[PDB]
Amino acid sequence: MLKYIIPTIMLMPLTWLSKNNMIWVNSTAHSLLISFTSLLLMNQFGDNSLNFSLLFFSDSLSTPLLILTMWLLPLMLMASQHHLSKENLTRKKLFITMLISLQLFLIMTFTAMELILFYILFEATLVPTLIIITRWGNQTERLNAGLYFLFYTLAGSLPLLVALIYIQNTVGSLNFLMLQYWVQPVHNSWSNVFMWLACMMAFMVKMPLYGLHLWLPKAHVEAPIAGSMVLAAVLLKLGGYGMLRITLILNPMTDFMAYPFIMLSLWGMIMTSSICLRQTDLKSLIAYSSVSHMALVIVAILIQTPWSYMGATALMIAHGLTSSMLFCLANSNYERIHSRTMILARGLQTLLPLMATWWLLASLTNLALPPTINLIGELFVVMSTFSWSNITIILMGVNMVITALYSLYMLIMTQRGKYTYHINNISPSFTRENALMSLHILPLLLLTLNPKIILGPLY
Amino acid sequence: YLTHQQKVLRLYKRALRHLESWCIHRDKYRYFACLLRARFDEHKNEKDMVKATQLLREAEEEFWHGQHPQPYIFPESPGGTSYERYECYKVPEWCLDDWHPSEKAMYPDYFAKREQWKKLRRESWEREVKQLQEETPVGGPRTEALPPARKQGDLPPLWWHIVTRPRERPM
Amino acid sequence: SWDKDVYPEPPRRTPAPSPQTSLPNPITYLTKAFDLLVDRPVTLVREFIERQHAKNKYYYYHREFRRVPDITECQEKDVLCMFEAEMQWRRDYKVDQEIVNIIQERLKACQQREGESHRQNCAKELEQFTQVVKAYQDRYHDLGAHYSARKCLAKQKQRMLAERKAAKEA
Amino acid sequence: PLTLEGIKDRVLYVLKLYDKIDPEKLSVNSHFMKDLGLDSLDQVEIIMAMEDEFGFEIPDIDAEKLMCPQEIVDYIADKKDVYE
Amino acid sequence: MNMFSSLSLVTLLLLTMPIMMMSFNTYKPSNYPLYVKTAISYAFITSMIPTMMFIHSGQELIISNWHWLTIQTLKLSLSFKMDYFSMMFIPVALFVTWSIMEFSMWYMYSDPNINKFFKYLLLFLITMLILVTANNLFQLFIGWEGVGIMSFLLIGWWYGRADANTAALQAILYNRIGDIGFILAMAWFLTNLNTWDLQQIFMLNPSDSNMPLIGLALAATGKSAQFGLHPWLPSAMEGPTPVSALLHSSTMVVAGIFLLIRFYPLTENNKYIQSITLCLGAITTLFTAMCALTQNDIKKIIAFSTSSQLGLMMVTIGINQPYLAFLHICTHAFFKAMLFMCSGSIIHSLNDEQDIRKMGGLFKAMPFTTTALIVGSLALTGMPFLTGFYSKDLIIEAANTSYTNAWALLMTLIATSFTAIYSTRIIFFALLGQPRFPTLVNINENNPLLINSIKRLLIGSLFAGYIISNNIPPTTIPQMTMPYYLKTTALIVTILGFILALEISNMTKNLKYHYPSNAFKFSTLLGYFPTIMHRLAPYMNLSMSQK
Amino acid sequence: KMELPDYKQWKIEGTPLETVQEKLAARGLRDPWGRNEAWRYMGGFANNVSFVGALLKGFKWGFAAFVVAIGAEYYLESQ
């Protein structure tokens, strides 16, 4: 993994040593080259994973998440440079440096063998994240509202640290390869119930789980576009990636300890989709859309069948590209009207014809139109949870109806109908914006031709 | 809000249009249109406005009972089949500003005439703002009506978006 | 092209044309038009390509995996022996998925081939599909997403205990 | 395609087929109530006939104010974007 | 098989070529609509060669050409089932689409987005041919949702109109409710069997098939707008007339019936699902026919005519006659697509007037539109030996002599009589009488695109039923022995419907003052299903969201 | 650019609009818009087929073609 760590670090000298007017050109060009070389990680095997060294490994789960992470850095740079153009030069380089350091922690996080090494990096990603959201965020409101920092660290980060420390004492190691052979069953015990919650609550909050999700809409309304892109696309998948790994050592206690979280996810899947129908803020609508989609991933991970793990991996990648594109589409409107209200500017298809095509494609993938990988992932989770209990088809089906409703409602409200009379500064879509959208959707649709490389290790 | 005189005439028009929806055939409609007209004529010269109001209220109750479930609606009227059919084709004039110079090079006469209008709008705006302020009582307007241009050379205040509104069949 | 024993097909019996109408058969005429305008030009192009291929002849091989001790012979917590047995079990699991796929493809090919007589003429294919699916279910069903040789063996021993017990009951 | 003269001709045409109007006393500037001595119930009927003539509705708020053929001609011309 | 299979795929591949050429390959936006019509016309010719081979020797194939994905023991491939139903449906749909596209070349002439309109019709056709030829449930799902989205994009064509956006989103809502049944079948077949292939499903032939077949019945209920999920089809009239012609004949609405025909080897041996689809169809065929009696919009009447005929198709499925249900899909596509093209010809002449109360006196004014409308109306109402008689007549005979629900049979016969009433209603108010339209007459049906497009469907509406019914092979034993009063039931109630409708129409001329009725308001307002459901259901959901 | 037909043609006499006027004159009323509807009942729009007439369109020539076809079918039998 040093062939990706070292070039990523070298983006920092490159950014600080570029000519003043070349910082965006230089970093975007070279970060796209790192993204190109990330495709060499797809040297996967049917039986073994790609174990590079004592610290890092890659398997079919982390590999697609790594490629998505490395793809997103150039896209974030393209999306950020317009609104940072009035920023002074030293602050543009610090902003770029935060994004590079965020990628450095993410690629290391997804490949760490040792779960304690994963924990330190899994938390180090918050330092660049909060700095980006707060220092370049919209308002004076605190994303780390204090209550959320306390609840998360007390009920999430700290219990996970103690559980991991406890596990290594008992097992003698937290290397994930070792945990595959030395795993022992978890018997019923009040102490074991608390180990289970400790091992899972941190990832539940980051997913987020329904009932622990109110932080996510607040963060999106405050974050800059790059913040929303990384947060939606990857940072939520850190919780999903963590659960897919740590559930190896939690059986068979997950057989019953998962019921409350499945209930929260199955019900919260419908409650958050319905909320999307009465959202007045695009960024909030997309944020609640992510909660609904990540409810499927939690259910898939907790019932742990081969089909649900394949569906979970596909869902995480598909949502990453789709939710990121939706935030970029909303941001482009915001950069003209300077408001997140969804009802303010209407009938935009009349004024921006091609951008309306990007909107339609983003909405069709969001509502899981076949054969997009959005549906492939969602169908697999639906197929698996039907076996878990046939009644779930009712809740899964109803959510499919509602998801189509708010996806097209968002498309209809903003793109169709009569345009707003007094808004007279809607300039034609820039090449930068059109290319930003097409770099989201083309890879998303091309993956329909070869879905196996996003189906994870269970494939 | 309306006068009594307006409510009756609105009920006469609405009554006729629903009667036309029931009758369908022009001769049958013309027969009952004169029967209906006669009913109004029977009470044209009433003077007791208490009776006149009670006559109107009973008429409107009668209308609601005899109302047609599916009255005919002109295609382009609110609720008709063509209502707002061409809104997707109406592009506001300010969009021409953002045209590329190569796009404007295709219509040199049209765009020359368009700067003449934009010049006229500029030179007129200050005068329009004064005329409204001087003619406007203290406390703001009492109604939405707007005045005409008073002098030769002036343009009626607030005219651009009325004059340059999209055609009703833009494409 | 493929192996006829693995993907069997019965001998084809096509009845001879026995026309009983003076009208020309437009299908036979379109067949000649196809055999002339489409097949022969296509065949010429392919034959040229296959000539280039014959000039350059190189070979690829089917990887052979020597057998190693199973998980039943590994020492507890001996990862070095558990690793090789675990990889071997995964390879066999992947192969067994494709053995079931071959049997399903035979069943589906049979149904289409037999037309309206498939219920009687595909009973052998149905029986074979039934037994293979049963054997696959016995091995690998209900192991979970975190399956392994260890959990496969635990399932087997549990099944072996139930079989042994019902023998006493008999 | 409508023209300002074609709208005029059809407006007057419809009025000349009204039995309450003298076709010799009718001109584009003939006020319905002051000149022709019609009532406000007749004015409603006249406007209804123009809606049928041209196939679109004139809302009651606008219809009240059309008290001569020329005003009707101007109203129809404006809604239809006729200019020559 | 080399010629049969090659020509089977070129037809599909050919239809996608105008889509690929949209990437500016010798692009000639001057006449893209003409290019699309030509591709359909050539696609019709090539599709007729496999059809002849099937007619000849019953040759059928599966083409599983591309292996897409394997999920352990579930191999997914791009597989086309080129069988009885695909052989005969594809030429009909291509023939009908060819006429609708030539008609659209004239109807949509002034639309600035003419090219985009034709691209959407081509995609709307492609997703239907993915549906019919699909050989596994996943590929069937791609087409199933494909038509749904194109329905949304074409119903909401005029996107500045809020009513158009509301009808487009209504189609999606009601159709995705039906898709709960589709995924339920997919989940059941994957779990209880181990396949989404139709071949392995029929080979295993489960007896405990209530759950997967209730899922398919629900999926067909929404897509083909049976009672319960039906209001969206009338609402879909917001789209341009050429959209309604395709929607109501050779694409979306028959997909629900087609799905249940595909699975007849399962519904054969399930008397419970047969009883559900019989009753489900029987109420639909009557209820929608009753609604059409009092409608005044010409597009609404034809739209309810479709729901009533789709109800009769669902009845045919429920009396265990799937091959007659298919024969009705084929024949119905001819005269139903024509009726929409005749309404559009009238609507266009009268300057976008769709209300029959403002029509009249068109019998001589529009002679060729009148001829096609009369032929179309007689074909719809089962006039002997026209295209509609070869399916409707056999369906009523087969329903009469089956071990059937008695109430469903009576409701099916009354709906047949009502068919003659609203068909008369269109002819009487649109063509007979004196003109009731504005005074500036722009009636002009003299356009070769309009004449030729309607003429080809008129020829189909005369001979298509006879030609098809004489070429398809027997798959059942038609029951031909039966009492006279059961043999002639369909013709008799059709004739009494015509007689009973003349009296009702003529009383509209008497100088008598009507009196509204509870029955009249019930039929006019569509039984109040939209008014109650479309207000109450959104209210409960939307108010629930905020709190 | 367009020529409106002379307005004095339009008289309600001979149409059902005259039946309407007679029925209204019994009640002491009159129909002032009668001539504005008269064009719908005159000259080309005056006489319209009935429903049975609409269905029987082209029957006369269909039957003439039918008698010749079956006759020509029988002439080919005796031969």
Place this chain on the structure above:
Amino acid sequence: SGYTPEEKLRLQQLRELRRRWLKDQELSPREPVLPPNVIYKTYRHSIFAFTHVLIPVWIIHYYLKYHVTTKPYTIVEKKPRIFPGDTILETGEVIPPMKEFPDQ
């Protein structure tokens, strides 16, 4: 109940401008200034058949004959119907007739 004297005057003044504006939407004769019989129908159709039928079937036939059909069970025929009295091409076999029908 008619227009007030100011209402008529404002309407008249907006009529002049609105009608002048619409007159100005007309295009000049030069605008837009752009930058720089059986055989015909047969050639258009002949070239269409070649590009949109012959080439596609060449590619499809090549694909099916040499890439699809060379893999097992990719194109599965329904076996032809054999009726009594037939002659099998592959073997030369002769299917016997059916029993003599009873009179009917």
Place this chain on the structure above:
Amino acid sequence: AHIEPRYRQFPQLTRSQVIQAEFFSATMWFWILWRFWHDSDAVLGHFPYPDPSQWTDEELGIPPDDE
């Protein structure tokens, strides 16, 4: 515009549309009569329907009431 719009009058027609409308109206009636002549059974009945009250006890194998 080869057809001029008219005011309050019956529209101008062409011969081509009137002749084609009549040809296809007469085709429909020829077809109905031609088929009814040759396939009248499809409308009235293909085969006789027996009256079961006529079948004798001998042929239905009904034993005598005292056997």
